[PDB]
Amino acid sequence: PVSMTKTSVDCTMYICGDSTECSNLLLQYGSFCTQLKRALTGIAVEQD
């Protein structure tokens, strides 16, 4: 193998389908999903 498919999960849409209340609850949980987006970007660049 040389690489895998590049996935670009976004926290807001995955964990809160178009719900502002859920979005606020996620936001109050702090920046737990910025790290997730950054890690996925890192692995994508790594496959490239």
Interacting span for other proteins (CB under 8 A) from 4-12, 13-21, 28-36: 28-36
Rg for the chain, CA atoms, rounded = 13
* 29 lines the binding site for other proteins (CB under 8 A): yes
* 14 lines the binding site for other proteins (CB under 8 A): no
Which residues neighbour 37 within 8 Å (Cβ) at sequence distance 6 or greater?
Answer: 9, 10, 11
- Separation CA 9–CA 37 (nearest Å): 7
Tell me the closest approach of the beta carbon of residue 21 to other proteins, in angstroms.
Answer: 18
Binding site for other proteins (CB under 8 A): 28-32, 34-35
